[PDB]
Design a protein around this ligand. Structure first.
Ligand SMILES: C/C=C\NC(=O)[C@H]1NC(=O)[C@H](CC(N)=O)NC(=O)[C@@H](NC(=O)C(=O)[C@H](C)CC)Cc2ccc(O)c(c2)-c2cccc3c2NC(=O)[C@@]3(O)[C@@H]1O
Ligand SMILES: [Mg+2]
Ligand SMILES: [Mg+2]
Ligand SMILES: [Mg+2]
Ligand SMILES: [Mg+2]
Lengths: 222, 222, 204, 196, 212, 233, 195, 82, 196, 196
């Protein structure tokens, strides 16, 4: 997994790969890792995928309840504090590492949360297996006062570095942009550089190839 | 604390034909979740129409290949430049491997060539030298992913004649060199798709009664 | 001694043109010793199908619990549960025991009654949803099934062809696994017709 | 991690580095290791980032409630809150915290709490991984009732030596000055303290 | 792995499977677990694959050496004890081999020895070694008779290997069957377990629990 | 050696149209302590080979002595030690790799990762790697430690394949190497701002630059970072 | 361990259980009935960890008897097997789980059919023509798979169990001191006088 | 000499799953001849000559004369002794 | 373990040895003679680790036969017992020791007296009227201590050993598949045709 | 243990403490941690007292033989002897040695050899338990080509701070000055360097 977040002058972008692996085996070649805590607060996950998904959904539900209670737009600091307190409560046993970006009434926010309950703030962040490779791109190409397209390109290039030079990442690149004045735009498969080449032969078997002992219709209706 | 063994990934496959043999392997060499090289060949021509690969610990593989090449050199020197038969090479490799029975070469070995009758031949060796001649054999990381596929398309396993209701099995045939090349490329593309340690490139050595030729094909780099 | 490898078994689901398929092995054994050749792993709730691989007792417990939950769901909503809703239910039920997990690998398959969309999904022992459109695999021969599927599959398969493909994949993966085999079943699920066929394979 | 707090005639100054590393990889090189628990009561944290952040958040909550109920807390009160949280949960916490405050009654005060929850009031306190490398220098270069400029220089030199020798420390030197005039944040970049 | 050997009036019957596994992954099903030591001596490969194969081939070389030195066929006891002394010299070093050396000599008649990596050397009449030794033992001990014909003894060995391959998960692939008389050993074919199971089920009325 | 004591961090190297470039920091770390500075980890051998060693500094000095002895032995009874019969990079590599694999096989390895970079007699660029396990691999970009994780993506963006080597100039390769050194200094706790860099060009020869420093660092944005989430001052 | 065998012949279920309980180097008893009559037409044989077996068996027995008294009705063998499987599945993840393996043999009067269930200490239930717990199966199955016919009579099943007991007495490193054999049919549960 | 020749033949068979060539066997036997002098040496050279006959697939039927001088010759016909 | 029993009557020594060899969960053989005739008037029964037993027994047998051939004389049972005890004592401190327990039964023709020696894998030799190796003694001794008389005949000793074998077949968790019984007297070593 | 060696224009000065402790008990409080391997080549030892003493004795033997055969050895030669002895026996040694020498050609030289056998030539070298506490001070107070008095003062202050902070060091500060004038032995007692 390779996830990155980059803040630009008018908001924040996050990006991730789309390769979920069960050990050395690729389980899903198009697993979206960008989750939605709130309509304009998103987060990329790494580590125990089930733990990340579950804590993100729980904090998103509680944040939606909080917004319906306070009649105010959700805030990134609130999701940050709730995630951090829960993770610290379970003493890192929830193996979730998140890069949480968002736009709220207070502005743009980009943070990172670790499984044990620590949080970091920065303009560019990277987490996951390829987090080093992506970071190599970031530290090489990040500057203050980035434009939207500049930050998008930087995040996509960091994710591409994680895809090419890290065995834990690959496939496509998902992006989510959150600008101050607009809605959040979730570009699923923003870049698809790993299209599979056409197979050398078709393996459509001639019907009747498999030996069948007995067939019986099963009534699914009631 | 010093572990004298390491894993470099990789996948090799050898298919024996009627009048030819083919030994192919991915050109990717890795360590943990990082890529060490995208073209470090492991399928070597050792002369006398004998191609050899020892996939696994790259150091042990290189050592075993070097020792076998030296053994072929000394065999030519000591026995009137007699050509080394593939079965003789297999027995010599068994003895080489079992020499380090208690410090095994952490490599699965596959050699390919032509037998004394001019037929294609492939021999497989476990790390300590248990050897067997087989029609098709894959070894390495994606071995578990390729060996069943071969059973379905090389030996026609579980494939029965259409319309015979599983009474008559599929008639076995000798696949052409083009067919085995197709099958090898499809196997390696699928391995690149589903295995993180396979990709970058596929190098095929084809041993016919006219000698050894090469065929290189690009693979996905994720 | 691995709780997922004491009893053994394999399940694989695939999709095609307006159809899905879900297949499983029929083997149950105490490691080396094979005990039962009639342990089917594909259960059905309404028009959704669930194949569970892993520790057999957890498989049966999950089957019973999900039957319970789907029955209560139908009694409350007065409608049959859809594959996506059941997938979410399986994920939530699995994660509910995150620190005391069920050593299983559920796989859901079906066709959405209202939209006709073929839908398959997989899970790990803690409920991580793996929603692939091509195929989902689980069991002791997960790697062999992965190879067979990534090699044989091509999208938009008719039921009679998807059956052959999934059956060949399951058989050639089970013959490469010592803890899988002893029979196999394949369900071909269409919008209004679901057929179940027992396969003939090696009993070793 | 290299942290310190020094009391000078006008108040107190906390100083720290900005390098938080997971092993040998610099996870964050712009970390703000100076945390505010009250308007003029700050803390330098060392050790488990999660533990230190949780302790600081709980102390800030308790001090906000104390402010709302009984007025401005003394530096000693924040020190005791930190001490309670660290000592009672010593078997599950890995945090060493220096607490520096300024109140017109007691001037400026510094309390260091190492592992175990012990609390020690000191004129100047140093802590963290790099502190071991500047124990001598500080003891040879510390004076009481210093001025703002010389106290900043002392903290800068100490943290520069700590960063130079301890690989676990680095980045930029951040200082927080608590005086009657208020709270001032100073930053010194590597191109400045490396040439010292 | 399941290997069996038993002596009867017609000679010696040897029957092995062909499955080699590394855990749950069947590495091969074309393994030859009967090692043709020489035209008169056979060995069963149960245990460590490379260990058994290498050391029984070395045993064959030593038997050829003995025949060159003494101008006389080596006795089954002699070769079995050679292998036993070798493995005892390698005891504790990590070898794992449970093999049966079977032969038919003029001095000894039909003779079967069990030699294990622990140094145990046992002359016997009915021996089963491997993960599925229990199943073949059951079948043989139930249906064994010294007065069996060559055909019936061959079928009994094949059926015991079949039962082992069915129940045992680590045994299977194909059945290799050998018949050893005084004039040497005779190969009686390689029988694929997949088809042999259905044939035996239809002809014998057995394996009723399995449906086909 | 069973446990490294004084350790050397990353080493980086790449190929360009006319040769190779290698570089390494000048830091000897006593674990977490940045104990020694000005420790040269690039060892030149002749006018066509540079060996970059990362790991146990004692074993690095042992390899230095071994390389010096190899030069001395190749000088013996060799009137052509100045020309055809001079130490080629491939010879030095293969020797070091044999030594490393032997030390591994004796359960007493040289706790090092070595990158041999040079130009052969025929002008071909030689770049190869060995480690305490004896593993050998060659790629247009090669790095050790954190180098292999961070510098390799940046350097591969310049030369992803062999076909990119003829197009890459010496200036591009040197700039990429300097950028990789700066990135390592950013994100490697055991890195040093002072490093050394060797360029082996089949035409220019061996250029050895010592006492180099990481320049053009971006640290201003650190002033805007406040707290770890909710804090503002 | 202890020998627990079971076979399902036409209109009957035969259960065999070792008579020996040995703690340490001394065989404490050679006449142990490792079965519990759950209901007049359902018997359960048990083996495993010392103490847990008898406790679990008598607990299940009390529960089944209470159900039969409350509803004035005998639960089908399938229902009893499901109940025992749920009990064992709840046990496996408890503080101190039950390490008991059971064979349930019953005669479903509603179907007039014999039913045999094998359940382990983990809660893995299977309905099988022949079943065994422990190492016993490792031998017995090989015989049964060959000599079992679905239309077998009760005497044929007894002879088959005798062959299994002979094989166990030959190739087992332990002397289980014979077996107590019980037959469950439409007329209830009876004990073979001598096997 | 005969023991060494037999051992070399069977050892080449074990190592290469093939029959040792006649010339190779004769050379291996002759290699022992000059291993004498004053524990890699013996007291005296051999006092016997050998006619080593054989057949291999490479050179067909072969006859060799092997002397204690470590030298061997291929004869179409050779007589040695009195 | 294997059952190794021995009794010394007025004019004979009777040895009982298990017929069962079991590797794993399968009894490989039910007719195993766990004895080696060291000399015409001295037999030795052995039990213990697989392989080591037969190896050590045959080694001792070869050495005793070589001595008897060289000196044209049969060594007294005491000498053979001392030799095997020295061998085992040298073995205990070797790299891979012999894990074999032995009972030596002989008839000293020079003294015309029966002699029974018990030696373990450590080299602990004792001359006893009745001896046993393994758990066997834990039962048999209790019988023998009561039912052993010095003036017992060979038939009385056989009946006593049969009673011991019955108690073992009753209260042992193992089926040692009977015992092979051998009698050593002035006329040499003979085997009882049937003991059960 | 706290040891150091400093090169000034006239030569070199080695300094050490005198506290050798077995655990928390001060085994010897007057230990002479400055050892002579040659007339003007001395060594400061840290770590295993047995290992350091054996290494120093063997180095003294080798240097005496070198003097007998080829004349006075260079400081680098003694450094290389120490390096060989430490590096080749790294798996069985726990010793850190500073070597300081004076030869008219190269003036004064200092070579520190830590664990592992690596040899590093430095203008000034510090080692031992207390060294970690004076890494900063020294780097801030060391200068090249100092005078004899200034070098003595530098070593005295550094070792005093190390003794104050490191409990493993203590006693008296022992110095050996190697110059063209010869060898001078200086001792400074606690009542002097504590007030510094
Ligand atoms: C073949 C007929 C009967 N014999 C078997 O059938 C047995 N061996 C095998 O399959 C495979 C062959 C193959 N090509 O896979 N051997 C290895 O892998 C080798 N292991 C290795 O190199 C390793 O250490 C790595 C961890 C593996 C990559 C050789 C070896 C080494 C030490 C051993 O103690 C054994 C085997 C061993 C002994 C007793 C029984 C078994 C063994 N090993 C098992 O795996 C098995 O259990 C199986 O039964
Ligand atoms: Mg890949
Ligand atoms: Mg990648
Ligand atoms: Mg199978
Ligand atoms: Mg089977």
């Amino acid at each position: 997994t390779t996830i990155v977040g980059v803040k630009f002058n008018n908001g924040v972008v996050i990006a991730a790969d789309t390769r979920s692996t069960q050990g050395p085996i690729v389980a899903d070649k198009n697993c979206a890792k960008l989750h939605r805590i709130s309509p304009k607060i998103w987060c990329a996950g790494a580590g125990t995928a089930a733990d990340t998904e579950a804590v993100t959904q729980l904090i998103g539900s509680n944040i939606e309840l909080h917004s319906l209670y306070t009649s105010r737009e959700p805030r990134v600091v609130s999701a940050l504090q709730m995630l951090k307190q829960h993770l610290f409560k379970y003493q890192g046993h929830i193996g979730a590492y998140l890069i949480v970006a968002g736009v709220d009434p207070t502005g743009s926010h980009l943070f990172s949360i670790h499984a044990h309950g620590s949080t970091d703030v920065g303009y560019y962040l990277s987490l996951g297996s390829g987090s080093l490779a992506a970071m190599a791109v970031l530290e090489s190409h990040w500057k203050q006062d980035l434009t939207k397209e500049e930050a998008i390109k930087l995040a996509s290039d960091a994710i591409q570095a994680g895809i090419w030079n890290d065995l834990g990442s690959g496939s496509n690149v998902d992006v989510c942009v959150m600008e101050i004045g607009k809605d959040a735009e979730y570009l699923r498969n923003y870049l698809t550089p790993n299209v599979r080449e056409e197979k050398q032969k078709s393996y459509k078997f001639p019907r009747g190839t498999t030996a069948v002992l007995k067939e019986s219709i099963v009534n699914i209706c009631d | 604390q010093f572990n004298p063994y390491g894993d470099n990934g990789g996948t090799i496959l050898g298919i024996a034909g009627e009048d030819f043999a083919v030994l192919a392997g991915d050109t990717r060499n890795i360590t943990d979740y990082s890529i060490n090289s995208r073209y470090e060949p492991k399928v070597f021509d050792c002369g006398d129409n004998i191609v050899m690969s020892a996939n696994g610990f790259a150091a042990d593989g290189d050592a075993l290949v070097k020792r076998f090449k030296n053994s072929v050199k000394w065999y030519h020197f000591d026995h009137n430049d007699k050509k080394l038969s593939i079965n003789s090479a297999a027995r010599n490799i068994q003895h080489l491997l079992y020499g380090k029975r208690f410090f095994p070469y952490y490599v699965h070995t596959i050699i390919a060539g032509l037998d004394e009758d001019g037929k294609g031949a492939v021999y497989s060796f476990d790390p300590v030298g248990s050897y067997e001649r087989e029609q098709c054999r894959a070894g390495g990381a994606a071995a578990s992913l390729i060996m069943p596929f071969l059973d379905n398309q090389v030996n026609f396993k579980n494939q029965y004649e259409p319309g015979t209701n599983g009474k008559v099995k599929k008639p076995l045939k000798y696949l052409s060199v083009e067919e085995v090349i197709k099958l090898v490329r499809d196997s390696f593309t699928s391995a690149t798709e589903r295995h993180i340690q396979v990709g970058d490139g596929l190098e095929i050595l084809i041993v016919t009664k006219d000698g050894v030729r090469k065929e290189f094909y690009e693979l996905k780099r994720d | 001694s691995d709780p997922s490898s004491i009893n053994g078994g394999i399940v694989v689901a695939m999709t095609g043109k307006d159809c899905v398929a879900i297949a499983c092995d029929l083997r149950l054994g105490s490691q080396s010793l094979g005990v039962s050749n009639k342990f089917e792993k594909i259960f059905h709730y309404g028009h959704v199908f669930l194949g569970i691989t892993g520790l057999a007792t957890d498989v049966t417990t999950l089957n019973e619990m999900f039957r319970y939950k789907t029955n209560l769901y139908k009694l409350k909503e007065e409608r049959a549960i859809e594959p996506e809703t059941f997938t979410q239910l399986v994920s939530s039920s699995l994660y509910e025991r995150r620190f005391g997990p069920y050593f299983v690998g559920p796989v859901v398959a079906g066709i959405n009654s209202k939209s006709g969309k073929p839908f398959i999904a997989g899970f790990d022992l803690i409920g991580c949803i793996d929603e692939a459109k091509d195929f989902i695999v689980s069991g002791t021969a997960s790697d062999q099934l992965f190879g067979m599927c990534e090699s044989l599959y091509e999208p938009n398969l008719e039921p009679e062809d998807l059956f052959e493909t999934i059956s060949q994949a399951l058989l050639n993966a089970a013959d490469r696994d010592a803890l899988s085999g002893w029979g196999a079943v394949v369900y071909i699920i269409k919008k209004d017709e679901v057929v179940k066929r027992y396969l003939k394979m090696r009993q070793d | 991690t290299s942290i310190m707090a020094v009391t000078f005639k006008d108040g107190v100054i906390l100083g720290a580095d900005s390098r938080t590393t997971t092993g040998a990889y610099i996870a964050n090189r712009v970390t703000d290791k100076l945390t505010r628990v009250h308007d003029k009561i700050w803390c330098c944290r060392s050790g488990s980032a999660a533990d230190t952040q949780a302790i600081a958040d709980i102390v800030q909550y308790h001090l906000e409630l104390y402010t709302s109920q009984y007025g401005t807390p003394s530096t000693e009160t924040a020190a005791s809150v930190f001490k309670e949280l660290c000592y009672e949960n010593k078997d599950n916490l890995t945090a060493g915290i220096i607490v520096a405050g300024y109140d017109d009654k007691n001037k400026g005060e510094v309390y260091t709490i190492p592992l175990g929850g012990s609390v020690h009031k000191l004129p100047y306190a140093i802590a963290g991984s790099g502190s071991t490398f500047i124990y001598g220098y500080c003891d040879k270069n510390f004076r009481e009732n210093m001025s703002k400029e010389e106290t900043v220089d002392f903290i800068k030199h100490s943290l520069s030596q700590a960063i130079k020798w301890d690989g676990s420390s680095g980045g930029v030197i951040r200082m927080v000055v608590l005086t009657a005039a208020g709270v001032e944040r100073l930053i010194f970049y590597p191109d400045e303290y490396e040439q010292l | 792995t399941t290997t069996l050997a038993f002596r009867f009036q017609g000679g010696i019957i040897v029957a092995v499977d062909s499955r080699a596994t590394a855990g749950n992954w069947v590495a091969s099903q074309t393994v030859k677990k009967v090692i043709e030591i020489n035209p008169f001596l056979l060995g069963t490969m149960a245990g460590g694959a490379a260990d058994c194969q290498f050391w029984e081939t070395w045993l064959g070389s030593q038997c050829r050496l003995h025949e060159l030195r003494e101008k006389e066929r080596i006795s089954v006891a002699a070769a079995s004890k050679i292998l036993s002394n070798l493995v005892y010299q390698y005891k504790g070093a990590g070898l794992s081999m449970g093999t049966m050396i079977c032969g038919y000599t003029r001095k000894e008649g039909p003779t079967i020895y069990y030699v294990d990596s622990d140094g145990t050397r046992l002359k016997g009449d009915i021996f089963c070694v491997g993960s599925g030794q229990t199943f073949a033992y059951g079948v043989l001990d139930s249906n064994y008779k010294w007065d069996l014909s060559v055909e019936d003894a061959l079928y009994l060995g094949k059926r015991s290997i079949l039962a082992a391959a069915h129940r045992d998960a680590y045994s299977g692939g194909s059945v290799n069957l050998y018949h050893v008389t005084e004039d040497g050993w005779i190969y009686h074919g390689n029988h694929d377990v997949g088809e042999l199971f259905w044939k035996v089920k239809e002809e014998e009325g057995s394996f009723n629990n399995v449906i086909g | 050696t069973q446990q490294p004591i004084v350790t050397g961090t990353s080493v980086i190297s790449m190929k360009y149209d006319n040769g190779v470039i290698i570089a390494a920091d000048n830091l000897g770390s006593y674990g977490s302590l940045l104990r020694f500075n000005g420790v040269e980890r690039l060892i030149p051998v002749g006018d066509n080979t540079v060996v970059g060693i990362s790991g146990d500094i004692s074993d690095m000095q042992h390899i230095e002595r071994l390389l010096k002895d190899l030069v001395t032995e190749n000088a013996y009874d060799n009137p052509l030690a100045d020309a055809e019969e001079a130490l080629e990079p491939s010879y030095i590599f293969e020797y070091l790799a044999t030594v490393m694999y032997q030390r591994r096989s004796k359960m007493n390895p040289l706790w090092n990762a070595i990158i041999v970079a040079g130009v052969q007699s025929n002008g071909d660029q030689f770049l190869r790697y060995v480690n305490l396990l004896g593993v050998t691999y060659s790629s247009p970009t090669l790095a050790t430690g954190f180098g292999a994780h961070m510098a390799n993506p940046l350097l591969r963006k310049v030369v992803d394949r062999e076909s990119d080597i003829p197009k890459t100039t010496v200036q591009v390769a040197e700039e990429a190497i300097v950028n990789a050194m700066r990135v390592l200094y950013y994100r490697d706790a055991r890195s040093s701002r002072n490093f050394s860099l060797a360029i082996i060009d089949k035409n220019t020869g061996l250029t050895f630059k010592k006492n180099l420093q990481v320049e053009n660092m971006k640290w201003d944005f650190a002033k805007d970072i406040k707290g770890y989430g909710t804090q503002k001052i | 361990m202890d020998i627990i065998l079971g076979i399902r012949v036409q209109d009957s279920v035969i259960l065999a259980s070792s008579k020996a309980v040995t703690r340490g180097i001394s065989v404490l008893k050679d006449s142990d009935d490792k079965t519990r009559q759950l209901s007049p037409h359902t018997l359960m044989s048990f083996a495993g960890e010392a103490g847990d077996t008898v406790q679990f068996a008598e607990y299940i027995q009390a529960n089944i008897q209470l159900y039969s008294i409350r509803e004035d009705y005998e639960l089908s063998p399938q229902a009893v097997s499901s109940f025992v499987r749920q009990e064992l599945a709840k046990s496996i993840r408890s503080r101190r789980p039950y390490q008991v393996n059971v064979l349930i043999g019953g005669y479903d009067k509603k179907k007039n059919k014999p039913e045999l269930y094998q359940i382990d200490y983990l809660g893995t239930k299977v309905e099988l023509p022949y079943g065994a717990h422990g190492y016993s199966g490792f031998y017995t199955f090989s015989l049964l798979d060959h000599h079992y016919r679905p239309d077998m009579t009760t005497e044929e099943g007894l002879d088959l169990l005798k062959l299994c007991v002979q094989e166990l007495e030959k190739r087992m490193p332990m002397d289980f001191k014979g077996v107590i054999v019980k037959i469950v049919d439409k007329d209830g549960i009876r004990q073979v006088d001598d096997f | 000499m005969i023991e060494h020749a037999r051992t070399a033949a069977v050892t080449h068979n074990l190592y290469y799953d093939e029959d040792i060539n006649v010339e190779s066997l004769t050379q291996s036997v002759c290699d022992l001849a000059l291993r004498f002098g004053e524990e890699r040496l013996m007291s005296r050279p051999f006092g016997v000559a050998l006619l080593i006959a054989g057949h291999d697939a490479d050179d067909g039927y072969q006859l060799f004369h092997a002397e204690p001088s470590g030298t061997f010759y291929r004869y179409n016909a050779k007589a040695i002794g009195s």
